[PDB]
Amino acid sequence: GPDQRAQKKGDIILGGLFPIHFGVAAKDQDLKSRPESVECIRYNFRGFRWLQAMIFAIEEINSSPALLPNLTLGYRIFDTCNTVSKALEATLSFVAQNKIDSTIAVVGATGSGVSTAVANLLGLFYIPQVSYASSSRLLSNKNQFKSFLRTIPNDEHQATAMADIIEYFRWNWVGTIAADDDYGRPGIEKFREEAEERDICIDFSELISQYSDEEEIQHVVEVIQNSTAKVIVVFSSGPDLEPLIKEIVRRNITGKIWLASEAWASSSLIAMPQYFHVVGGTIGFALKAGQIPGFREFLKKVHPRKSVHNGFAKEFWEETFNCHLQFRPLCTGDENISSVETPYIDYTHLRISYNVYLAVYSIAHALQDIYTCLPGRGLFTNGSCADIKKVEAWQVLKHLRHLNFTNNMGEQVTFDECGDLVGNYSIINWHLSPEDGSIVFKEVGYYNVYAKKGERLFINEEKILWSGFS
Amino acid sequence: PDQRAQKKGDIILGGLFPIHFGVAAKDQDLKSRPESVECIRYNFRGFRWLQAMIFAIEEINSSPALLPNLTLGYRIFDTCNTVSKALEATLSFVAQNKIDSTIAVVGATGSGVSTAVANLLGLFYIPQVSYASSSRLLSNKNQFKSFLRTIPNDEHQATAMADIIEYFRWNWVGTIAADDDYGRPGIEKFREEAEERDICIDFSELISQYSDEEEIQHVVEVIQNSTAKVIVVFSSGPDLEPLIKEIVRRNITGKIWLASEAWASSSLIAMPQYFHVVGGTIGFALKAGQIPGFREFLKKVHPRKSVHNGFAKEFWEETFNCHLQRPLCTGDENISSVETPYIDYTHLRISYNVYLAVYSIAHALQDIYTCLPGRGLFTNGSCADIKKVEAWQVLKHLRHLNFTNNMGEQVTFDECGDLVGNYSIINWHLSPEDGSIVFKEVGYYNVYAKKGERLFINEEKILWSGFSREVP
Ligand SMILES: O=C(O)[C@@H]1Cc2c([nH]c3ccccc23)CN1
Ligand SMILES: O=C(O)[C@@H]1Cc2c([nH]c3ccccc23)CN1
Ligand SMILES: *[C@@H]1O[C@H](CO)[C@@H](O)[C@H](O)[C@H]1NC(C)=O
Ligand SMILES: *[C@@H]1O[C@H](CO)[C@@H](O)[C@H](O)[C@H]1NC(C)=O
Ligand SMILES: *[C@@H]1O[C@H](CO)[C@@H](O)[C@H](O)[C@H]1NC(C)=O
Ligand SMILES: *[C@@H]1O[C@H](CO)[C@@H](O)[C@H](O)[C@H]1NC(C)=O
Ligand SMILES: *[C@@H]1O[C@H](CO)[C@@H](O)[C@H](O)[C@H]1NC(C)=O
Ligand SMILES: *[C@@H]1O[C@H](CO)[C@@H](O)[C@H](O)[C@H]1NC(C)=O
Ligand SMILES: *[C@@H]1O[C@H](CO)[C@@H](O)[C@H](O)[C@H]1NC(C)=O
Ligand SMILES: [Cl-]
Ligand SMILES: [Cl-]
Ligand SMILES: [Gd+3]
Ligand SMILES: [Gd+3]
Ligand SMILES: [Mg+2]
Ligand SMILES: [Mg+2]
Ligand SMILES: [Mg+2]
């Protein structure tokens, strides 16, 4: 398949898709000569941390004597660049065998639009796909997406929570902005419905994107400038929001209350100190934090030399230390990860990373359910089992549909009729560190998704900066 | 795939068409290996669309002038209006390219299907030309690099709808949309235009061909519990039909249905036994087109004689309600005896789009044949060898194509690969002779006129629940 990858031989292979870059280089093809392949641009350090979590879990599992003793799990992991096209190349390789008529399960993708395209494909071959971050309600539809599950809750809930926060503060006047894609559009539509039920009025509603032109941006900023609304609900990823924010910062638009969907509420592309006068004090959703003992130590052993199997480790290094590998200065090889602050390690809570880790453990546990299957008390015809020596993707899907297990956090992980896994939300507020001068995601409440209306939202008003500054 | 239509040729065109309306929705407990889904309910109008493609190709081969050195071939599959079937087909289209042979594709129908396909063809810069997918999502050329269409996108249609409501001073309307890339974006556009005109929306529900009974009951309840008489519906017939059945069942009467073009002419909904519910709907229709020879071509269909079109056998069986060597078929019987949409039509609209999609591929190939070195489109004005053409060269030529159809019109695609078109506005009457439903034209929408001056309606021509000339 693709040139850049992370890959290790095993008896059973797990596919993986991660956004190691935020995007593709937009040298928009006029098709004057044969199109070469696009280049991926702007390193995503957080995304590399996500990919590490999958490798950590797979290595943790091959070490565990308990879980899958006779066998080893391998992996084939690719960069999507938040791009359907790159993600589809990689996926064509995952199903290369199957298509001619080997990959047992795929962990990914991140953006709901990317996961959709991938799912349309894997679904043809009943290859289970477990996403760590794709939250569009569209993916719950099991007629269209036969093999899709996720370790993240869908956005029906998040959008309802957004409307509940607004009602909580007795606000009744807002604007909305959403990314023009299968994450933003269905999310804000839901929010609209919920806002109406609670007599919350929406004065404007606009769509944006990573690739909006200057005229389209100017227009959105004008609508904003021209509106009495102080509270602006935004349903979007970092990359789709960054152009709008750059212009809003350029024109110095100040003291809006920004309500962030989980995709941008922790994004290092928006939570930048030079934007704080605009973006300070945003309130947003985050997934519940999880714990991976050993992970931080694993992330510090990265090395362009030592790491044979992870072929993303080279460019990681170069990006981190701003050098090149055997004028861009050459790299010693002996530089220290702890000297440069990047999102790779400069984090406090593991949230999406935890989902990656659970996505892998799900696949693993469903394989463990096949290892220990007792003939007669199995899930296939006449109580029969599946042969783990010769396992087929659809059998893992089957096992994933019936899975129930207890995670290191001591929780039961099972998937519903739609392949979703319910979860609660943290509510964070953007403060400025007086120690660092950097932005700090202060936890200020939580939303318990399944609870009687009026007993779901828990907030500490005392803790909130409304402009973000002490 | 087993069931197809194909013929060898120098350059192959792909084709996707909905020969069946859907799939048998048998949910799989995956206790054993899954078998494929079975396509259910034959779509005669869809067979005609596929016929228009084959017609246009043979005609083009017959033309000496257009592409002399070469013959055009075709490999043409059934999507069953399903992403999955369309993608199996598509994987075979790209099979050569992927391994690193198909030069262009015509289709698909449903925006949701063309979306899925377009993601795939786009990797390999294989041009795709849709005769019927009208989602604005498809105008986005960053995501859909190789997509064009011979149908206008719905931006105007949804605005037209809101112009119609403003005109009659209607005030608190209902909305219903198919849950897919046709319905959601159309209604999202409609809502924006309704906001600009201070038109309020009382409800908005989603529907689908595959919605269970609980999901339908709920929509029917929302409708029943509403004061809204005016209901805007953006959907295909097949996704709508389950809803209409239950509405007719509960006798829900005197609604004014505003019909998007995908169902405004649909034989699944335009059925006399629904006329007490569905009568008097107002809707949109594409400009008609003329195809000389085509009617005659449609009558030469034969399970025997048609060696290349492997859909004809099932066509025959479904038409005449027989079996092939549940009575056995003579193999002699007359197509012009049984009334089905295959031949029972007055105007060619989508069929004309199919035709034009094929000729657009053709005319872009022709412009390669006749390229003059130095005056061409590529590097240093260079040209492309037509003996060894590559899909992306056709894409390039298709982006800049400009030619004259048989109706005497200029066919070009804009920066987004779209094509503008006006609309007729039609109203659902009953036939006094026939008892069948009739699409009477009662207005037009002219897309070239300035904002506020695009709609025209003849009030006198409207029958208000199919029958009444007395309004309020
Ligand atoms: O489905 C989607 O597109 C968004 C993508 C996304 C989510 N969380 C994130 C955190 C960082 C970056 C991207 C994301 C949840 N779902
Ligand atoms: O993009 C879509 O899904 C539709 C499907 C469709 C259109 N026109 C039709 C006529 C007959 C049957 C189906 C259709 C236009 N847009
Ligand atoms: C914003 O305000 C000014 C004056 O009110 C107007 O000229 C401008 O066009 C407005 N823009 C938008 C997008 O509403
Ligand atoms: C932005 O606005 C603030 C307060 O409204 C003002 O004090 C400051 O000077 C402005 N910044 C710029 C760069 O104009
Ligand atoms: C998962 O296991 C626990 C007990 O171990 C049980 O309470 C729970 O109901 C199970 N979930 C499902 C969906 O079967
Ligand atoms: C509609 O009306 C009935 C009876 O008034 C009520 O019980 C039901 O909940 C309503 N359903 C909806 C969807 O409004
Ligand atoms: C449905 O109601 C209408 C009166 O509006 C009438 O034409 C028809 O007979 C009714 N049928 C039933 C079964 O109620
Ligand atoms: C197509 O050609 C005609 C004249 O031959 C011209 O009027 C028109 O501008 C052309 N269309 C486009 C889109 O270039
Ligand atoms: C649209 O309508 C106007 C008047 O009916 C006509 O002049 C124009 O050429 C039409 N364009 C079409 C059908 O493409
Ligand atoms: Cl991704
Ligand atoms: Cl189709
Ligand atoms: Gd609610
Ligand atoms: Gd407008
Ligand atoms: Mg092991
Ligand atoms: Mg809007
Ligand atoms: Mg010829």
From Swiss-Prot, chain B:
Binding site for phosphate: 45-49, 349-351
Result for mutant: residue 393 to R: In HHC1; decreased G-protein coupled receptor signaling pathway; does not affect cell membrane localization
Outcome of swapping residue 179 to G: In HHC1; decreased G-protein coupled receptor signaling pathway
Resulting phenotype, residue 8 to R: Does not affect calcium sensitivity
Positions annotated with a glycan in the UniProt record: 69, 225, 251, 334, 380, 402, 422
Region Ligand-binding 1 (LB1), residue ranges: 1-152
Effect of residue 303 to T: Mutation found in a patient with primary hyperparathyroidism detected at adulthood; inactivating mutation; mutant CASR is activated by a higher calcium concentrations than the wild-type
Ranges facing Extracellular side: 1-472
Assembly mode: Homodimer; disulfide-linked. Interacts with VCP. Interacts with ARRB1.
Official protein name in the record: Extracellular calcium-sensing receptor
Shown segment, full-protein numbering: 22 to 538 of 1078
